[PDB]
Design an enzyme around this catalytic site. Structure first.
Site, PDB file in Angstrom:
ATOM      1  N   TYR A   1      -2.070  11.259   1.613  1.00 37.99           N
ATOM      2  CA  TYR A   1      -2.925  11.420   0.452  1.00 37.99           C
ATOM      3  C   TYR A   1      -2.824  12.654  -0.320  1.00 37.99           C
ATOM      4  O   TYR A   1      -2.891  12.568  -1.267  1.00 37.99           O
ATOM      5  CB  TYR A   1      -4.388  10.959   0.879  1.00 37.99           C
ATOM      6  CG  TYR A   1      -4.496   9.300   0.929  1.00 37.99           C
ATOM      7  CD1 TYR A   1      -4.146   8.589   2.069  1.00 37.99           C
ATOM      8  CD2 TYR A   1      -5.257   8.617  -0.239  1.00 37.99           C
ATOM      9  CE1 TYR A   1      -4.478   7.318   2.264  1.00 37.99           C
ATOM     10  CE2 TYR A   1      -5.335   7.431   0.030  1.00 37.99           C
ATOM     11  CZ  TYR A   1      -4.927   6.584   1.174  1.00 37.99           C
ATOM     12  OH  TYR A   1      -5.312   5.116   1.291  1.00 37.99           O
TER      13      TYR A   1
ATOM     14  N   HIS B   1      -6.961  -6.747  -0.213  1.00 33.87           N
ATOM     15  CA  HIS B   1      -5.922  -5.935  -0.414  1.00 33.87           C
ATOM     16  C   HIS B   1      -4.734  -6.237   0.835  1.00 33.87           C
ATOM     17  O   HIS B   1      -3.666  -6.109   0.452  1.00 33.87           O
ATOM     18  CB  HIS B   1      -6.758  -4.479   0.049  1.00 33.87           C
ATOM     19  CG  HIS B   1      -5.663  -3.459  -0.095  1.00 33.87           C
ATOM     20  ND1 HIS B   1      -4.713  -3.327  -1.188  1.00 33.87           N
ATOM     21  CD2 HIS B   1      -5.012  -2.485   0.843  1.00 33.87           C
ATOM     22  CE1 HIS B   1      -3.837  -2.162  -1.092  1.00 33.87           C
ATOM     23  NE2 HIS B   1      -4.089  -1.649   0.064  1.00 33.87           N
TER      24      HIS B   1
ATOM     25  N   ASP C   1       0.804  -1.136  -0.019  1.00 33.07           N
ATOM     26  CA  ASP C   1       0.030   0.298   0.124  1.00 33.07           C
ATOM     27  C   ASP C   1       0.734   1.241   0.043  1.00 33.07           C
ATOM     28  O   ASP C   1       1.756   1.200  -0.844  1.00 33.07           O
ATOM     29  CB  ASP C   1      -1.005  -0.126   1.197  1.00 33.07           C
ATOM     30  CG  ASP C   1      -2.007   0.977   1.268  1.00 33.07           C
ATOM     31  OD1 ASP C   1      -1.950   1.990   1.645  1.00 33.07           O
ATOM     32  OD2 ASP C   1      -3.133   0.879   0.481  1.00 33.07           O
ATOM     33  N   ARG C   2       0.775   2.372   1.083  1.00 36.16           N
ATOM     34  CA  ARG C   2       1.342   3.371   0.945  1.00 36.16           C
ATOM     35  C   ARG C   2       3.094   2.970   0.972  1.00 36.16           C
ATOM     36  O   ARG C   2       3.892   3.577   0.141  1.00 36.16           O
ATOM     37  CB  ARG C   2       1.475   4.279   2.118  1.00 36.16           C
ATOM     38  CG  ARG C   2      -0.305   4.649   2.341  1.00 36.16           C
ATOM     39  CD  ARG C   2      -0.751   4.829   1.092  1.00 36.16           C
ATOM     40  NE  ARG C   2      -0.451   6.257   0.715  1.00 36.16           N
ATOM     41  CZ  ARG C   2      -1.126   6.710  -0.417  1.00 36.16           C
ATOM     42  NH1 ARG C   2      -1.891   6.140  -1.169  1.00 36.16           N
ATOM     43  NH2 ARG C   2      -0.758   8.078  -0.968  1.00 36.16           N
TER      44      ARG C   2
ATOM     45  N   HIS D   1     -11.591   7.222  -1.676  1.00 38.00           N
ATOM     46  CA  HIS D   1     -10.901   7.953  -0.356  1.00 38.00           C
ATOM     47  C   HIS D   1      -9.464   8.563  -1.103  1.00 38.00           C
ATOM     48  O   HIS D   1      -8.801   9.415  -0.478  1.00 38.00           O
ATOM     49  CB  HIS D   1     -10.392   6.832   0.521  1.00 38.00           C
ATOM     50  CG  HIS D   1      -9.552   5.914  -0.051  1.00 38.00           C
ATOM     51  ND1 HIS D   1      -9.911   4.962  -0.939  1.00 38.00           N
ATOM     52  CD2 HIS D   1      -8.201   5.277   0.421  1.00 38.00           C
ATOM     53  CE1 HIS D   1      -8.866   3.941  -1.243  1.00 38.00           C
ATOM     54  NE2 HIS D   1      -8.058   4.284  -0.527  1.00 38.00           N
ATOM     55  N   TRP D   2      -9.034   8.170  -2.304  1.00 37.70           N
ATOM     56  CA  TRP D   2      -7.839   8.740  -2.935  1.00 37.70           C
ATOM     57  C   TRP D   2      -8.146  10.400  -3.095  1.00 37.70           C
ATOM     58  O   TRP D   2      -7.168  11.200  -2.743  1.00 37.70           O
ATOM     59  CB  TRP D   2      -7.587   8.289  -4.051  1.00 37.70           C
ATOM     60  CG  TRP D   2      -6.633   7.151  -4.008  1.00 37.70           C
ATOM     61  CD1 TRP D   2      -6.519   6.068  -3.045  1.00 37.70           C
ATOM     62  CD2 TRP D   2      -5.218   6.762  -4.604  1.00 37.70           C
ATOM     63  NE1 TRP D   2      -5.649   5.194  -2.971  1.00 37.70           N
ATOM     64  CE2 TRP D   2      -4.807   5.734  -4.137  1.00 37.70           C
ATOM     65  CE3 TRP D   2      -4.642   7.611  -5.378  1.00 37.70           C
ATOM     66  CZ2 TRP D   2      -3.514   5.153  -4.428  1.00 37.70           C
ATOM     67  CZ3 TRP D   2      -3.394   7.148  -6.033  1.00 37.70           C
ATOM     68  CH2 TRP D   2      -2.709   6.015  -5.180  1.00 37.70           C
TER      69      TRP D   2
ATOM     70  N   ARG E   1       4.452   2.356  -2.247  1.00 36.56           N
ATOM     71  CA  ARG E   1       4.708   3.576  -3.087  1.00 36.56           C
ATOM     72  C   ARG E   1       5.967   4.037  -2.801  1.00 36.56           C
ATOM     73  O   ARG E   1       6.573   4.609  -3.592  1.00 36.56           O
ATOM     74  CB  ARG E   1       3.544   4.525  -2.858  1.00 36.56           C
ATOM     75  CG  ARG E   1       2.195   3.750  -3.294  1.00 36.56           C
ATOM     76  CD  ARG E   1       0.786   4.524  -3.338  1.00 36.56           C
ATOM     77  NE  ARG E   1      -0.286   4.021  -3.628  1.00 36.56           N
ATOM     78  CZ  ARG E   1      -0.604   3.395  -4.938  1.00 36.56           C
ATOM     79  NH1 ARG E   1       0.032   3.964  -5.973  1.00 36.56           N
ATOM     80  NH2 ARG E   1      -1.447   2.711  -5.141  1.00 36.56           N
TER      81      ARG E   1
END
Lengths: 297, 294
Positions: A217, A278, A108-109, A153-154, A112
């Protein structure tokens, strides 16, 4: 009242120029940094990290601003919570441990941060795994009606402060639990260890922590997208050998076919789906750990 | 304790088969209906209705489920809050007054009811004015990064219940004020009458009303898009003379070119204002409506 879900793991408080990074440390062998995502902390790896600890020195870090890591004060451009700044801060923290060359697996984050790290400083990485993500650029480029409803939510969490912070503060418990549940295959919290959910709930109960995540975000909608855009338009490919894992019921597969997107972003990618939503390390801990051990060995 | 911002306008409760429609009614002449949007009520027309009531019978209605109008029970498809269903109920409410052929002006959600009404029952309208909207289908078709960040609420309020309802309850006062402020030219609440803001605020303080608004945006994401899609694919156009007004601030491939694809007879002009034409720029908006409707 929060459980230790890493029996036998040490705890490190790594100072960096941008604040402290908390990490559970265990095992021995080559260094393998594990980065969690939203809305979680390092403890999401509690099911897989013991198995990785058999073959690697595993460092399970809270992201900058997350969990027990310090919270750098953000700025107009959300700089400390861009993945580029996060990647630089975690490099600095790995250098404190004497790890100038390590393997990285992110979810997830953290996934990235991981690929941004691989793009900004590929010499720090021997191998890289990313779990259930496509690049930030790709999510935005594919943001049609169907996807904008799925990952609403993005755009919601990227709204200017303090709009999401004010709405989240009425009942934080509801939101963090809603996001954990809705992204699993089962649609509930049954896949997670109750003790793990406590870690996530408590981290989300702190207003500063929730702001950090919105900052994350906000960077994702702006600077992170811009950083990705320059690379994809320059043909900048990741030269680090990488694994891309994704849940058949996860977020990345909804946007496109994950392995084909990643082949546009890295010269040496292998990919595998995992029957899971996820949260691959918690929904499918056996399958995830095996895919990671195989790839990193 | 709300202010009467329509001095002299009557107060009518219009029965329909789906619930009562509340309306302020004033003036005389041809029937002209005014439809508000999100997150407002009929009182948003309080600055231009007096100028229109010099020429028309002005019917300033709360949308079904909004303001003081009744809230019909929704369903899995959010049917009552689809723009097709709200238009049918407003047709019914106008029939209760003997108004089967009337002029229509809509802003925001009320403008989506309006063009949907123009598409479904074009014979009901003499003329049609939409304020600062494009067709719902065009919004979703144009959905990209810029648009998703700009009208984030189109996807947020369209999430399954109780997700938006729960989060809107986190701070309902801030959110409606934020929406009001963020969409203006000035960027604050200075364009609005504080007595009108109080109306928007107290309406937003009712969770059932907020749920209604979520059902409206859930419709906007699904059934309303599908209804629009059929008309695009079938090449169906609004045959009613159309006026498209939009704020130069707060949304250039022009709304005119877009509305020309949806209507056969459409005039258009920008208004120097944000999203809320009738309150940020009442003189410009009233003048344009009068010239078009008269």
């Amino acid at each position: 009242d929060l459980a230790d879900l890493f029996p036998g793991f040490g705890s490190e408080w790594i100072n960096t120029s941008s604040g402290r990074i908390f990490a559970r440390v265990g095992g021995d062998g080559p260094p393998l940094l594990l980065l969690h995502g939203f809305p979680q902390t390092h403890v999401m790896w509690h099911r897989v990290a013991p198995k990785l600890a058999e073959r690697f020195k595993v460092i399970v870090a809270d992201l900058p601003g997350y969990g027990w890591s310090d919270m750098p004060e953000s700025d107009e451009q959300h700089t400390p919570y861009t993945k580029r700044a996060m990647a630089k801060q975690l490099i600095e923290a790995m250098e404190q441990l004497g790890h100038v060359h390590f393997a990285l697996a992110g979810h997830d984050r953290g996934a990235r941060v991981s690929y941004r790290l691989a793009l900004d400083s590929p010499g720090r990485l021997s191998k890289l795994a990313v779990l259930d993500i496509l690049p930030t650029y790709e999510y935005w480029q594919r943001m049609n009606r169907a996807y904008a409803l799925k990952i609403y939510h993005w755009s919601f969490l990227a709204q200017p402060a303090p709009l999401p912070e004010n709405l989240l503060g009425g009942d934080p418990d509801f939101y963090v639990k809603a996001k954990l549940a809705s992204w699993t295959r089962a649609g509930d919290l049954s896949a997670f260890d109750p003790r793990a959910v406590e870690h996530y709930r408590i981290a989300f109960a702190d207003p500063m922590r929730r702001h950090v995540m919105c900052e994350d975000y906000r960077a994702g909608a702006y600077a992170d997208f811009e950083h990705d855009k320059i690379d994809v338009e320059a043909g900048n490919k990741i030269p680090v050998p990488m694994l891309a894992l994704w849940g058949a019921s996860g977020i990345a597969q909804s946007a496109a076919t994950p392995l084909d997107v990643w082949r546009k972003w890295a010269s040496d990618v292998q990919g595998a789906p995992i029957e899971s939503g996820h949260f691959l390390p918690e929904e499918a801990p056996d399958q995830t750990a095996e895919a990671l051990v195989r790839f990193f060995s």
